[PDB]
Amino acid sequence: NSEEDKQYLIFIKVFQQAMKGNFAKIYAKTEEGKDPPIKKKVERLRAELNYCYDELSFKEYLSDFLVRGGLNKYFNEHQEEIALLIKKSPWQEIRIWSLLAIASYKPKD
Amino acid sequence: NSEEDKQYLIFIKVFQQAMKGNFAKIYAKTEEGKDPPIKKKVERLRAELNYCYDELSFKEYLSDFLVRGGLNKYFNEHQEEIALLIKKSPWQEIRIWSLLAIASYKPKD
Amino acid sequence: NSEEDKQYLIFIKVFQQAMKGNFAKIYAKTEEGKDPPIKKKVERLRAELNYCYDELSFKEYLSDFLVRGGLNKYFNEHQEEIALLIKKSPWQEIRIWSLLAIASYKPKD
Amino acid sequence: PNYYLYGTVLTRYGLASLNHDIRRGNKTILQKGYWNNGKIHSFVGSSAIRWALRFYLQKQGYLVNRVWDEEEHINRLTSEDFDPEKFYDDDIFGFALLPNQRMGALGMNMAVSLTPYDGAVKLGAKSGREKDSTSLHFTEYHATRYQYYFGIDATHLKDFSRILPMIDGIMNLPKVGGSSNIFNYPFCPDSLVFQWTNHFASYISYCFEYCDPKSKEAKLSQEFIDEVECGQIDPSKLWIGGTIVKDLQQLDNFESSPLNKAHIYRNRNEMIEALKTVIKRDLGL
Amino acid sequence: PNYYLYGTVLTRYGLASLNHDIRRGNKTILQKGYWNNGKIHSFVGSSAIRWALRFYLQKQGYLVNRVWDEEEHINRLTSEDFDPEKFYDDDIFGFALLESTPNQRMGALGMNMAVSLTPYDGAVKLGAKSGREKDSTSLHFTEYHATRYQYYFGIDATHLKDFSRILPMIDGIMNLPKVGGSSNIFNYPFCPDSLVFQWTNHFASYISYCFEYCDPKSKEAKLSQEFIDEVECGQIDPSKLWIGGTIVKDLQQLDNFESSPLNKAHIYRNRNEMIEALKTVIKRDLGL
Amino acid sequence: PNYYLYGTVLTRYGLASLNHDIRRGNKTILQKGYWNNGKIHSFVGSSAIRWALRFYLQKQGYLVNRVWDEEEHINRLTSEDFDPEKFYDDDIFGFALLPNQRMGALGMNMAVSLTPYDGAVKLGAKSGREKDSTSLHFTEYHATRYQYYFGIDATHLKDFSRILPMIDGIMNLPKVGGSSNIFNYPFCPDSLVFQWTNHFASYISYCFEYCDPKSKEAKLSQEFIDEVECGQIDPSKLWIGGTIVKDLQQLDNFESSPLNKAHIYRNRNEMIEALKTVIKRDLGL
């Protein structure tokens, strides 16, 4: 319930879909007998997320990550809501939401 | 409400329309039974957006992008304020908005 | 058990699994010596949790720690409930629950 | 006649790490709490400023019961029986035996940071190799201006002339207790609002406020300005000095505002001299 | 009397990756935080400058309790009991022997963190271990910053056990060795290029950070208008003000400079002449 | 006595694509960033220059630990345990294993383009047909002269005589960067400003500047000339040579200027010989 909570939950879904897309891209990148990353790419994503000073940089990285994720439906249905949520709100809060999505993305894969 | 977000939203919409026109132009470019890439087009757009190095770069780039977008109705009703928003505001913020528009573009087609 | 009690227990289990992951990471990084310290890790975690002074800093640290934990199967099974509980509840109560989870932790034999 | 000197001073901008709270594990916790807008603001205890004033008195004659050794880092009492009639320290800051106990001629409030504290953590390591438990540590700092409010009861002084050294020390405050080695923060004021009145009603407490999160412009106020306009805080009893004068004089309709006829000096020393002349005239010094 | 030497020194323009933060991932980040106008500036810790001063004191002879090995990267103490009377470093920087003459000393030098004059926007440098083989320690990133640095210090000269030790400290501030950082790939000389020193006998300074930028992405540096207003209004006695460096040219190019009270300060374009005059005044005042 | 060799090196004019940013997509992004007067300048990393110096040391037969294969394009270590006494590269550039560490006697800063980077992208198609990933491509190039600043702590060398090969390598620097097949950019100096002094203070870092934002002409910055004329930078310790010598000598009042007393040689080889003679005299070689 509550509009803010629904927006937060479906933004978590958006971020989880984006990480699914990025992880699929990494899976496609690797070849041969080398073991494709699963956990260390998550650690890389964590390191890149914490590497974020001020706002401009974090929003740039978040937008780049979302685009690199590729196709996603939760952002498809909700354009205005997530656009306003990302444009507004402190960047630290959005980083907290992104980390919370990271910690709970894995049930998908 | 607080019409800055109105300008942000119709900027997103005009960006989505312009990119759709560009994907249509690329569809016109390709020929014969090769499948016209769609995800690769988005990847190419993201890479070109990240190629810029402030001010002149990405400003003439995004102006040319909107121009090649074709007949954009919302742009026609929103020439002046979109141009003013382009001239003002930091360029990295414009890049963030463009990347968000890319991430939220799909459900048109 | 009420739904609030269920979510509280799931959060305790989530935090315990995150501590399991962090301590396993420390064990792997500090295999040298007679044995990597365990009490020192708990003291470090307690000091870092008590360092937090406001909601934003504490929730940032909590999300960072939870992601550093790893898979966190209890968070896999409960995206929305645990995410809403973390976002909504006052940070002092979440710190109390986290410290209770720390106290009620069993290192793997 | 009872005379009181209330004042709120504003320090210069710089990185301050002076009132570490308790230390939490690896971190020296800068003392902070909620303030104004529900944001976390760093604090400097008033006891630190009182210690700085005590040190100022000790360093320049001014017989004091408590003597800071500055070498053994201990306090020595010249006379175990406190005598406010002879020592500046006992007269002004009071005492308590646990007698007479005084009451204290100077009352001070905790210094409040003009800006919220975001994270401001600084890393610290000890050279290289043979690393031990003390090798890694963190220190909290803060890049803002500090603001505190004080009030001195001139009549309560055993010797009335002792108020002048307090003004001089407040304007020439020594190192206020803190990490001076790593974060050297001068506590001398760059903006002052002094009120030399004869009743126990002050409306200048914590007048300075700018918020504007991370900045240093430090506008005076809107509530204090409105208080001046409304009719109370008569400008004849108001003394404003410092860098705030430049912003005050650039305001619109300033020449017609009642704030104009207040004792406003850009130079702090000139305003201090005029205020001390007024105080000496009023107290019969 | 109680004489204090305050000063704000501005470094030279150059790529600087001097002080870093927690290792994080593959990217070494600078020590940065909000400084002015809500913009993020890069910082250099004052402990780095204190270490550089200690190294200068060690290199130019002198007696220092802490001796940097410079070969094993280890610190050795000549005497386990700190003696500020004999050793320069103990007298100047103090000591604190907590493990369990006084065991603690406050030192005569008080420094503040060096703040980049220019906001830190981007400036991440790609680094590769090269070769054809790749591994975990192959692709790394290092943050740099093309800016001038500016720090504030204050000396309680009377607190020194030997009053003559202030002169080597000024010499070290002038000829400062490398400040801890990646000098292999980012060699940043920390020698001053503009000085604002004040040799007064009262605690107030008002010269904490007198340098401010223009055109925030440029190397040009000017004296802050607040400092100039402080000088002109009557505060900051010009006879106690020592200004030297490349800021001298900009100061002299100002209009109405001759009529300004700033003209009465000790202004030397050559830093060596200004330092010599200041040291002459210091020796006269301290009875050296 | 602690002797240090500071120097700023200006390269020749040409089309350069030496250091690239992260490579993905169509464009090979030139390593660029902000510089003086707030314009984008192309950069060349100091690690590449250090690699070129080490490669020069290898090609001249000097004993080094790391050896470039030139066939497998990998780095081979002759000895797993670094020994600065025996190997030139370990002595000069240091090492880190993770004594297992050494700071190295050479400290070098990143190379900065004299001229701002405006445009000049190159077309990278590969023959005809089969338009695969090796098809239409873009490469960024810059037509400018790069400038870098280095500093050598001569006393830090295990063998004092090793400074001379370092100077020779700086003179005859091998291939720097990667795009040598299509952008052959010699990195040998054409203008030099060296300082052989016994002070940690250096005032010659990035002393060159352009006269026209789009021209190949180079000129010593007015700040450097003012520094020499004021009294700083002892001319007896200053070594200036290269094509900047002609421009320096065409300056008015050059004879009366203190810059005339500096060691100014139009021929770079003569400057290097004289400086090496001075260095050998001072270091007792």
Phi, psi of E247 (to 5 degrees): -70, -15
Question: Of F167, F173, F170, F190, whose CA–CA distance to F244 is shortest?
Answer: F190
d(CA D282, CA D158): 16
| Among chain C residues, CA nearest to D38 | C54
Interface test with A, best of E40, E43, E120, E141 (most A CBs within 10 A): E40
Interface of F with B in 110-129 (CB under 8 A): 117
Only one residue has tokens 């670094």, namely: F82
A contact test, residue of C11, C61, C63 with most A CBs within 10 A: C63
Q: Please tell me the distance from the alpha carbon of residue B56 to that of residue B67, in angstroms, as a whole number.
A: 16
DSSP type of residue C70: -
- The string of DSSP letters for F106-119 reads EEEPPEEESSPP--
Of E123, E187, E193, the CB nearest to F149: E187
**CB count in 10 Å sphere of residue F30:** 24
D126: left (phi over 0), alpha (psi -120 to 50) or beta: beta
- CA C97, CA F268: separation in Å to the nearest integer? 73
b (16+ CB within 10 A) / e for E110-125: bbbbbbbbbbbbebbb
The angle formed by the CA atoms of residues D265, D266 and D267, to the nearest 5 degrees, is 90
Give the closest residue to E26 by CA, choosing from E123, E143, E121, E130. Answer: E143
For residues F151 and F103, the answer to whether their CB atoms sit within 8 Å is no
Q: Which of E43, E159, E203 is the closest to D172 by Cβ? A: E203
C-beta of residue F106 within 8 angstroms of C-beta of residue F93 = yes
Residue in chain E lying closest to F177 (CA): E130
For residues D17 and D175, give the distance between their C-alpha atoms in angstroms, rounded to a whole number. 12
Partner residues linked to D68 by β-bridges: D75
Verify whether the Cβ–Cβ distance A103 to C64 is below 8 Å. no
How far apart, in whole angstroms, are the C-alpha atoms of residue F39 and residue E146? 12
Q: Which residues of D touch E75 (CB under 8 A)?
A: 127
E-interface mutation test, from A41, A50, A54, A55, most E Cβ less than 10 A away:
A54
D133: contact with C, CB 8 A cutoff: no
* E132/F74 touch (CB, cutoff 8 Å), yes or no: yes
Query: Is the Cα torsion angle B64, B66, B67, B68 positive or negative in sign?
Result: positive
Contact between chains at E25 and A53 (C-beta distance less than 8 A): no
Q: 10 Å Cβ neighbour count for E28? A: 20
Taking the C-alpha atoms of residue B46 and residue B24, their distance in angstroms, rounded to an integer, is 17
- State the Cα–Cα distance between residues A21 and A16, nearest whole angstrom: 9
> Does the CA dihedral D167-D168-D172-D174 come out positive or negative?
negative
Rounded Cα gap, residues D80 and D84, in angstroms: 12
Torsional sign, CA E72, E77, E80, E82: negative
Instruction: Tell me if E244 sits within 8 A of E271, measured CB to CB.
Output: yes
D23 touches chain C (CB under 8 A): no
Q: From CA A98, how far away is CA A108, in angstroms rounded? A: 16
Measured distance CA(F218)–CA(D212) in Å, rounded? 46
Closest residue on chain F to B40 (Cα)? F25
The C-alpha of F229 sits at a distance from chain E's nearest C-alpha, in angstroms, of: 9
Radius of gyration of chain B (CA): 14
Q: Are D21 and D31 in contact (CB under 8 A)?
A: yes
The strand ranges marked E within D99-167 are 106-108, 111-113, 121-125, 136-140, 143-144, 146-153
Cβ distance of E46 and D128 shorter than 8 Å:
no
State the Cα torsion D199-D205-D207-D211 to the nearest 10°: -170
| Reported resolution, Å | 3.1
Q: Is E194 left (phi over 0), alpha (psi -120 to 50) or beta?
A: beta
Sign of CA dihedral C4, C7, C12, C15: negative
Closest CA to A72 of A8, A17, A23, A4: A17
Sign for the CA dihedral angle at C74, C80, C81, C83 comes to positive
| Distance, C-alpha F108 to centroid of its chain | 8
For residues F150 and E14, the answer to whether their CB atoms sit within 8 Å is no
Count other C-beta atoms under 10 Å from residue E129's C-beta.
14
Q: How far apart (Å, rounded) are the C-alpha atoms in residues E124 and A68?
A: 21
Q: Which residues 107-126 of D have a C-beta within 8 angstroms of E?
A: 118-120, 122-124
- Å between A79 CA and nearest CA of chain E: 30
For residue E114, give every residue at least 6 positions away whose Cβ sits within 8 Å of its Cβ, in sequence order, or none.
Answer: E11, E43, E44, E45, E46, E49, E149, E150, E151, E179
- Phi (first) and psi of residue F67, to 5 degrees: -125, 125
Alpha-carbon gap, residue D24 to C25, rounded angstroms: 24
d(Cα D17, Cα D187) in Å, to the nearest integer?
A: 12
Do E and F count as touching (3 or more CB pairs closer than 8 A)?
A: yes
How far apart, in Å, are the Cα atoms of E238 and each of C96, E196, E233, E255, E265? 59, 11, 11, 18, 4
| Mutation for D interface: E203, E210, E237, most D CBs within 10 A | E203
Dist CA F261 CA F240 (whole Å): 11
Cβ-defined contact of D143 to E34 (cutoff 8 Å): yes
Kindly give the pairing relationship between strand E146-147 and strand E149-156: unpaired
- The label of the residue with tokens 């979302």 reads A66
Query: In 10 A of CB F91, how many CB atoms?
Result: 24
A-chain residues near E40 (CB < 8 A): 53-54
Q: Which residue has the tokens 């002792």?
A: D162
Handedness of CA F222, F227, F233, F234 (dihedral sign): positive
Residue B102 near residue B45, CB atoms below 8 Å: yes
User: Contact A8/C87, CB-based, under 8 Å?
Assistant: yes
> Which residues in chain B touch residue F32, judged by CB atoms under 8 angstroms apart?
53
Strand runs (DSSP E) across chain F, as ranges?
A: 4-11, 14-16, 27-28, 32-34, 40-44, 66-68, 75-77, 95-96, 101-102, 106-108, 111-113, 121-123, 138-140, 142-144, 146-153, 189-197, 208-210, 218-220, 238-242, 263-265
Q: How many CB pairs under 8 A join A and C?
A: 62
How many CB atoms lie under 10 A from the CB of residue C69? Answer: 22
Report yes or no: E72 and F99 within 8 Å, Cβ to Cβ: yes
Whole-number Å distance between alpha carbons of F106 and C19: 45
Counts of helices then strands in chain E (DSSP H, E): 6, 20
Q: Is E27 on the interface with A (CB under 8 A)?
A: yes
CB contact under 8 A, D122 and E107: no
Asked if E208 and D225 touch (Cβ cutoff 8 Å), the reply is no
Query: Using the beta-carbon criterion (under 8 Å), do A87 and B100 form an inter-chain contact?
Result: yes
Query: Which residue is closest to A66 within chain B, CA to CA?
Result: B103
DSSP string, F245-258: HHHHHTSTTTTTSG
**For residue D5, which of D92, D97, D100, D131 has the smallest C-alpha distance?**
D92
SS3 F104: coil
CB distance E25–A43 less than 8 Å? yes
CA distance E125 to F17: 16
User: Under a CB-based contact definition with an 8 Å cutoff, are residues A21 and A70 in contact?
Assistant: yes
Q: Are A69 and B83 in contact (CB under 8 A)?
A: no
Residues in B whose CB is inside 8 Å of some CB of A read: 5, 8-9, 12, 39, 42-43, 46, 50, 90, 92-93, 95-97, 99-100, 102-104, 106-107
Chain C neighbors (3+ CB pairs < 8 Å) = A, D
Residue found by looking up tokens 């390591």 in the block: D125
Kindly list the residues of chain B whose beta carbon comes within 8 Å of any beta carbon in chain F. Answer: 44, 47-48, 51, 53-54
How is chain D split among helix, strand and coil, in percent rounded to 5? 25, 25, 50
CB pair distance less than 8 Å for C47 and D24: yes
Please report how many Cα atoms fall inside a 13 Å half-sphere around the Cα of residue F178, on the Cβ side.
14
Residues 6+ apart with CB under 8 A from F94: E184, F84, F101, F102, F103, F104
* Contact call for residues D103 and D94 (beta carbons, < 8 A): yes
**Per-residue DSSP letter, F20:** B
State whether F40 and B53 contact (CB < 8 Å): yes
Method: cryo-EM
